[PDB]
Amino acid sequence: SEEQVAQDTEEVFRSYVFYRHQQEQEAPADPEMVTLPLQPSSTMGQVGRQLAIIGDDINRRYDSEFQTMLQHLQPTAENAYEYFTKIATSLFESGINWGRVVALLGFGYRLALHVYQHGLTGFLGQVTRFVVDFMLHHCIARWIAQRGGWVAALNLG
């Protein structure tokens, strides 16, 4: 169900952020991303980890774009929702597929890192809510549910 997927997204996104950050260090710090709630081998934990792994190429397409847009827009706590929404919407103009789902998580990762570096602390909860809200209202949660839920991503291998 779509609400199931939405609520699973909190753990999936936290895990994605954790492993994306870890793999990036294993290659800007943000200790908030290492001290996240925390089950590595849990089901949604493994989903997050798999998305970070398989996303190493698609993020090569998107990362640089996300960084320049963020340096230009200068998100504040007040306008972050507006800008997150604009950019997330561009990711799904023509397609929903698992690659664009991974792009969305990657943009949430980049937004969170960017605001931390510019002095906004404790913003990951808000970024997570932005992700979930967008996924609900833009049928991304429904789409994932139709594919069997987030656990379906474990088969992307």
Side-chain angles (χ1 to χ4, degrees), residues 8-9 11 44 48 52 56 58 70 79 126 128 143 149 153 156-157:
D8 280 340
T9 300
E11 189 166 16
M44 297 299 150
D56 232 320
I58 53 214
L70 289 170
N79 63 33
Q126 192 81 326
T128 308
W143 182 94
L156 296 170

Side-chain angles (χ1 to χ4, degrees), residues 107-126:
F107 174 58
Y109 173 77
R110 283 291 164 208
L111 202 215
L113 190 55
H114 179 279
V115 304
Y116 178 78
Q117 292 174 299
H118 287 92
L120 196 53
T121 58
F123 206 66
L124 275 161
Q126 192 81 326

Side-chain angles (χ1 to χ4, degrees), residues 65-66 68-91 104 107-108 110-112 114-115 120 123 126-127 130-131 133-134 138:
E65 194 75 14
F66 296 157
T68 129
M69 290 191 95
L70 289 170
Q71 291 169 38
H72 278 199
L73 298 166
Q74 311 188 341
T76 56
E78 287 61 43
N79 63 33
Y81 177 69
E82 176 187 359
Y83 297 153
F84 174 92
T85 298
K86 176 189 164 73
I87 295 160
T89 299
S90 77
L91 304 181
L104 178 64
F107 174 58
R110 283 291 164 208
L111 202 215
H114 179 279
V115 304
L120 196 53
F123 206 66
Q126 192 81 326
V127 182
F130 291 174
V131 174
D133 171 78
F134 179 89
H138 287 75

Side-chain angles (χ1 to χ4, degrees), residues 44-63:
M44 297 299 150
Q46 294 188 215
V47 173
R49 182 171 90 81
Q50 191 59 31
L51 293 173
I53 287 171
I54 72 191
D56 232 320
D57 268 57
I58 53 214
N59 77 16
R60 292 181 173 194
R61 305 228 312 252
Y62 293 95
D63 257 338

